Design a protein around this ligand. Structure first.
Ligand SMILES: [Cl-]
Length: 158
């Protein structure tokens, strides 16, 4: 249902790193961020699905190596804050899902939480601030159906 996003810090539904601002999309204001929550040994996050390939929705090549990737690679993009100007590029993280399954994946790109809602991004909103955007291989390795679109995970460097 419709609830407050705790990363945004609204409290409109109460009792019933902060956003940098907003970008307005399909009549909806999306928060922008230059930051993400603290990276820990067990960093809570949302896993979404991204097409990293030449024939895909992901826009340009991946930031880290300026290349496209097969979606059978275990690879992720990270929200701007976590991407941190490329400091985690080429490194492995370990993702753990709610079913207790785990997978390692290589950071190859940024899930950009500063920009969006325009022609360069196809009218897609800016990324949220707590996102690990994984390939199909990441999803199937955790035993998850990418059709649910988003799941809770934790991650850390590996
Ligand atoms: Cl720690």
């Amino acid at each position: 249902k419709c609830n407050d996003d705790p990363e945004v810090g609204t409290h409109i539904c109460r009792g019933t790193c902060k956003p940098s601002g907003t970008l307005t999309c399909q009549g909806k204001s999306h928060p922008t961020y230059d930051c993400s929550p603290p990276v820990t040994s067990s960093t809570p996050a949302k896993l979404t699905n991204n097409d990293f390939s030449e024939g895909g929705d992901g826009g340009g090549p991946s930031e880290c190596d300026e290349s496209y990737h097969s979606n059978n690679e275990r690879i992720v993009a990270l929200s701007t804050g976590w991407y941190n100007g490329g400091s985690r590029c080429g490194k492995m993280i370990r993702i753990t899902a709610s079913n207790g399954k785990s997978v390692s994946a290589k950071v190859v790109d940024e899930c950009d939480s500063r920009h969006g809602c325009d022609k360069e991004h196809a009218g897609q909103p800016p990324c949220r601030n707590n996102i690990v955007d994984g390939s199909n291989a990441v999803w199937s390795a955790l035993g998850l159906n990418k059709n649910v679109g988003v799941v809770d995970i934790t991650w850390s460097m590996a």
